[PDB]
Amino acid sequence: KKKEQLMDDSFIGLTGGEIFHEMMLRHKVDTVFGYAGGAILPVFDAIYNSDKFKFVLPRHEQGAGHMAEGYARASGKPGVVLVTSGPGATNVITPMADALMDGVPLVVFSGQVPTTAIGTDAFQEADIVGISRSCTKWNVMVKNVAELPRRINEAFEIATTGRPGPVLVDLPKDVTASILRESIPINTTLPSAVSEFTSEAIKRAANILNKAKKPIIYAGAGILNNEQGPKLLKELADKANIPVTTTLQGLGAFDQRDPKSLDMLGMHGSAAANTAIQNADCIIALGARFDDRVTGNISKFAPEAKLAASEGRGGILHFEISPKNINKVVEATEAIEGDVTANLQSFIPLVDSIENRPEWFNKINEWKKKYPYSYQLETPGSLIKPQTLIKEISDQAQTYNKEVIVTTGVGQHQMWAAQHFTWTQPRTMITSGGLGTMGYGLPAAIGAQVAKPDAIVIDIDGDASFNMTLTELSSAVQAGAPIKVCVLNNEEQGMVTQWQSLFYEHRYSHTHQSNPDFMKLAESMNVKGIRITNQQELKSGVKEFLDATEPVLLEVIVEKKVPVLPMVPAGKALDDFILWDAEVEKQQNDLRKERTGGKY
Amino acid sequence: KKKEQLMDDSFIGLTGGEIFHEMMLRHKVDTVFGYAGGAILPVFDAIYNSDKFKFVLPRHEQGAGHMAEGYARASGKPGVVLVTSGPGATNVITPMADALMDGVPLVVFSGQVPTTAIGTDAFQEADIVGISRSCTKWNVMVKNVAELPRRINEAFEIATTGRPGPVLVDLPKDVTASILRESIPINTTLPSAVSEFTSEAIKRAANILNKAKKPIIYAGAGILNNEQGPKLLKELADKANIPVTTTLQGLGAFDQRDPKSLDMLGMHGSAAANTAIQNADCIIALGARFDDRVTGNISKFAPEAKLAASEGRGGILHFEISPKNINKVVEATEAIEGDVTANLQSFIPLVDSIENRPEWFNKINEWKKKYPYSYQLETPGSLIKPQTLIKEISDQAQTYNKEVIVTTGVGQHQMWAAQHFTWTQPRTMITSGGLGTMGYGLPAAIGAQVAKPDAIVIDIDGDASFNMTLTELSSAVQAGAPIKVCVLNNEEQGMVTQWQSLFYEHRYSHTHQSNPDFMKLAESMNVKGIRITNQQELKSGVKEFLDATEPVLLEVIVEKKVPVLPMVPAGKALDDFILWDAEVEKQQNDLRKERTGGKY
Amino acid sequence: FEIATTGRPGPVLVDLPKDVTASILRESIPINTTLPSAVSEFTSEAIKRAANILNKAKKPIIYAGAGILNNEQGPKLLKELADKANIPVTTTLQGLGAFDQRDPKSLDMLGMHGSAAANTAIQNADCIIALGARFDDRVTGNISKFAPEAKLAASEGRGGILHFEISPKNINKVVEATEAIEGDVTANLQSFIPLVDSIENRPEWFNKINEWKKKYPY
């Protein structure tokens, strides 16, 4: 009777592949990134010429993975990856580890050899469940077609709840080829208050903030996981009159044009932001995990907030969805567990409205003034400075009546992009932060461009980073993704040569990879190519770059052996930073010249 | 007293990095493949401008991994990889899994975050020991500099003994930066009979072979792991008058010009070889693991040898170094554990010399005659057939007074290379067999070319495979490796479209990746480019290809939608194969044309 | 409960954090989670093939294990098969009680400490019907020398090993099955037996068996 109402037979007669297809539809998947192979053919046959989602074909499964990541961060939806067994699956390991570190909802479907062949070292067999265990929230191997819809639901649910992250679902070929012959629980054929412990924590947190004389908001990626996040962040900052700093992954969560913006904090963050957090009596941590790039020397981190906590007049208020990241690095004075945006809705009305903080904002404005992102400007005849390039792109990009999304590679160009872009909108900085994967920039841009077809998507890339995955240029063309790749060509692994200049007496050990001709490369890939070689080409070259309505590769020759500053050296407190100094740079240039015999 | 003789203080005062450097020397490492990064900088500083080995810089760590694999298979030495933490390390996972499946001695050294930061989700931290566990023979994280020499010795020993395979050694930054302050056991500062159970097995095996009327040697990669291997294989085949078939990985272990050669067996192997092994009363398995590509339907494999075993007049004699692979797939009548070459030295003198086997070799010669690698020849106006291309390359390559080493990508081109090359020398087929990694061809060739600077090294590649890792072209130039890349451009994932033609009614689901302009690509990479577009350019184009003394990319336009034959379909016995038939191919072409509306 | 009781039964562990078991459910849950819970023609064809092999056998033996006990009808169908095709039955240690040892067709327990009659019979049988038993190393003795007559018969297409096994992991793990019949042994016996020819007598085979039983008491 009611048993017929709780069981569903609508999938009976379908192959596992066809069931996969139907479940993608029910999960509102509109894009799949993948690459075919023997073990996953039953699924590829099922999705053949599907009009239900766009399929994006990379040149390499790592490309699929990073594309799905870019897609996920741009769209707020899970990025879906479909690959074959063996090397198809192991090729997604770096994107999976990447997604885990950066909290990216990734759902990876990997073909697998038939169940009858597992553990025999079969053709193209990898133990992907074993291998991917450490770099996924969760994984599973489907053992029969009857449980396939359930595993799919489970995968999407886990990927998108708590701290978002990657999941892998292993699909044996005989399972996806097999036909469902039995009815299954109808709940498996479909996708899907505040605890007073937390409610009391929130009230307690509000009382702490209402005492604060030097508050600061420390906002991260978590605030981006809800569309109302940035709005409520602004509402809080406005109401209680609080300066806001963000992590690298929080960039765009707060309007940096706002006077209350302290810009990015951390190792390569603003000295103003770093100074402010070191002197704040109350730190409001909104969806940020106190990563070691942000805290500096942990024992010396946030001295004023720890003092205030001990004296019952401040401390750290940590709004965090994942209990694992609460009290992992720094002790929270109050832990507010759950979605930061939801908890802010309860928090803000308990927070007293504050008109002015003369003394605090006097310090903040003074710090902002004395700590700009200073660097050595161009001189007559010199190459374009990489910092100036970023400014040019940022200024000209904001000119179009389109959303602007930025992805990056990893290295100096990445930090300069973070520093010198003006960040104003959520989900516009798409960068590999936790794992820091070189090669991320181009495929992430393709994924973001597919998520946001009407956006300007700029990959600010390094020459060494771009080399990692440049084959995916063909993928952009085939996908119809008019991405804009800007290669900051300093002909070096800049971030490593900076460390080698600094700590290894200018011994540049294998940090200069030879580059292809990027213009002939672009041409070979059927992509528009622009090369900027001198200061006088900067403005017009960047305009042509942004005006392009097709995929375009811009190469910019930029100054070499230029350090990213400010810098908080490892072991040092956040407010014990190295600032840019003109004479210091001159001396460093002379020293480098002498030690390398004029080679660098 | 003697304590001073057993302890060594010669490393005291050295950093972990410097100790690493010294241990590479002591392990006679002459080549390192790697890519720098923060966590591994102390090691890179130590090997800075080292004249003790050649350093090879890829564009991607996967490149380093596959290069090291190519190097190892060409040289018989372990391939050494040096990468940084996080993504540097996870990027070597596919090469590691590749090396495990193909028994390749790979020693991977990965930088790691400081010991003080492990398990904190630190900057660029991956659990590479956890991740790589399933795809290494063994791995370890060094915890202090005092144990670094021991772990290094242990790594090389494990990688190169038993069945060779990949090992990973994780190197925390603070360990490699730290200085050895204490003396260490002198045995750790240096690198490094037959059981009568085996001796009796050998005698028993000889008696079985001396009864055999239809013997066959089934030779694999294991015979290549000793320089005397091929010689002793030949000695055995000559003495007892035995036809020889090899696996894909055994290609070159036996002179295929020899009348006793049955060529390659298996799914895409010769129908003559497959027929012979199905009818043999005694199978001598020499360093081969009865992979599922070779056995066909296991329950129907080697019927005559199983019958002979049951009747005490034959069976399977398995010479295998790894106990795990003895009796894993098929029951060995006699298991001869240990190095196949060493055991052959004992085996052969117990084997009776045999002049003639009229009846057996009559069958073999008849099978060889009726089962050539037939295919549809070129017709006027048609594109070059991929099989003909391979023949041309093989014929012209054998013309030079240089060793010729072949690497491949994965797909149809790979099997056609295997089939249509004439294999005569050991360690000349370097191909991804167990994992089957597309993208392997180019970096493997670079590694092989570095191992063998005076060899002609040809990467027979697919267009889709080549796309995976084509960025490593720059790496070949920078390394001074004059590799010869031949892209068989059928503008398709040929091996997948073959399965889709065959099993999915010509539904080509996402199996046509767009290709770059390979000639402009080569130009952008500073590599010589040659394009062959028609039959009349084949000979002269291949000559120019082989005559080149610089890195060169040859693109050949070849016929599309051509199946690799013969084929043993999954589920079928080895002697239940599909043969090429002209009329059948014509009908298949018409059917494909009709179903795809003339598109394919 | 589902995993513990399906396939080959086995242990499962469910870890219950104190704050979870102390916590109170505040939200509705899928109603399917509040409640507990044909034959593939690949197997159907295997069964038919197995029957044809047994119908050729001149020296059959049933090798019955714990699996036959996992269904209440198991022992009944085992007896029905043994009676119909006139087959001597040996069991593992874990199969003890699956077959009435008072029955003349009982060979008692086989293996390291099993009856020499049972061990002799299985070594000389041309067809071995493995019913819910996993060919453990206490049972097979030297694996390479195990069941010589059944391997010979298989090679000659007149016998071999018919393995009724619910867990694919244990199929072809130790010895090659001539025919693998995947699934519940009792359910598959219901299909198997009617395809099996009824046999009145096996004079020569049962003469050996009775002689072995007589010369090999405990």
Ligand SMILES: Cc1cc2nc3c(=O)[nH]c(=O)nc-3n(C[C@H](O)[C@H](O)[C@H](O)COP(=O)(O)OP(=O)(O)OC[C@H]3O[C@@H](n4cnc5c(N)ncnc54)[C@H](O)[C@@H]3O)c2cc1C
């Ligand atoms: C070369 C390089 C240099 C770098 N230098 C810097 C630097 O100077 N400054 C800097 O900031 N970063 C830097 N990083 C990046 C740094 O390593 C981290 O990736 C970054 O700081 C993490 O930012 P995050 O905490 O906001 O994001 P995440 O790492 O994603 O952490 C977000 C936190 O919020 C939680 N969360 C997620 N969703 C929610 C929700 N809905 N509600 C509540 N909580 C939620 C998560 O569980 C997590 O704890 C650098 C990276 C590279 C490659």
Ligand SMILES: Cc1cc2nc3c(=O)[nH]c(=O)nc-3n(C[C@H](O)[C@H](O)[C@H](O)COP(=O)(O)OP(=O)(O)OC[C@H]3O[C@@H](n4cnc5c(N)ncnc54)[C@H](O)[C@@H]3O)c2cc1C
């Ligand atoms: C598209 C594709 C199609 C393929 N089709 C075929 C095909 O048709 N035919 C074919 O043969 N292959 C084919 N393969 C390759 C196949 O998957 C295996 O990789 C290959 O057959 C394994 O060959 P092998 O056993 O000789 O080498 P290995 O896999 O390396 O095994 C060697 C064995 O020898 C042992 N051994 C190693 N060293 C020693 C020693 N010193 N002494 C004794 N023993 C030792 C090893 O432990 C191991 O058991 C194909 C691959 C691909 C990608």
Ligand SMILES: Cc1cc2nc3c(=O)[nH]c(=O)nc-3n(C[C@H](O)[C@H](O)[C@H](O)COP(=O)(O)OP(=O)(O)OC[C@H]3O[C@@H](n4cnc5c(N)ncnc54)[C@H](O)[C@@H]3O)c2cc1C
């Ligand atoms: C000191 C000592 C001495 C021993 N000596 C002997 C000896 O001489 N002889 C002997 O027999 N044992 C001996 N053993 C026991 C031996 O080690 C094994 O435990 C025993 O032989 C296994 O019997 P089994 O295969 O029937 O049961 P199991 O180990 O439980 O295996 C049952 C098989 O049937 C399968 N199965 C389960 N349910 C079903 C189903 N519904 N349908 C189909 N298949 C199913 C299972 O997956 C499994 O493969 C000894 C043990 C000890 C401690």
Ligand SMILES: Cc1ncc(Cn2c(C)c(CCOP(=O)(O)OP(=O)(O)O)sc2=O)c(N)n1
């Ligand atoms: C895959 C990988 N390998 C190595 C590193 C280590 N690494 C390396 C080698 C960097 C140099 C990047 O060079 P680039 O040209 O892309 O950028 P810049 O010159 O602007 O710094 S940055 C960095 O963190 C990494 N992050 N990712």
Ligand SMILES: Cc1ncc(Cn2c(C)c(CCOP(=O)(O)OP(=O)(O)O)sc2=O)c(N)n1
């Ligand atoms: C990294 C990876 N992804 C997917 C596969 C699956 N796969 C795919 C997609 C093949 C087609 C290879 O295309 P190709 O152009 O390189 O070669 P051919 O056209 O000559 O077959 S072959 C093969 O096994 C694989 N082996 N490796």
Ligand SMILES: COc1cc(OC)n2nc(S(=O)(=O)Nc3c(Cl)ccc(C)c3Cl)nc2n1
């Ligand atoms: C699409 O390209 C290819 C190439 C191919 O062999 C070279 N195969 N082989 C197949 S299969 O039928 O044998 N299935 C299969 C696979 Cl994928 C891995 C392991 C095992 C044991 C099996 Cl049974 N499917 C394939 N697809």
Ligand SMILES: COc1cc(OC)n2nc(S(=O)(=O)Nc3c(Cl)ccc(C)c3Cl)nc2n1
């Ligand atoms: C060479 O390029 C770079 C770039 C860089 O930060 C962006 N760093 N940071 C460093 S470090 O001194 O802080 N060491 C370090 C590393 Cl690598 C990972 C994790 C932790 C906790 C530490 Cl302590 N070394 C670096 N090298």
Ligand SMILES: [K+]
């Ligand atoms: K900024």
Ligand SMILES: [K+]
């Ligand atoms: K050949």
Ligand SMILES: [Mg+2]
């Ligand atoms: Mg650079």
Ligand SMILES: [Mg+2]
């Ligand atoms: Mg191709």
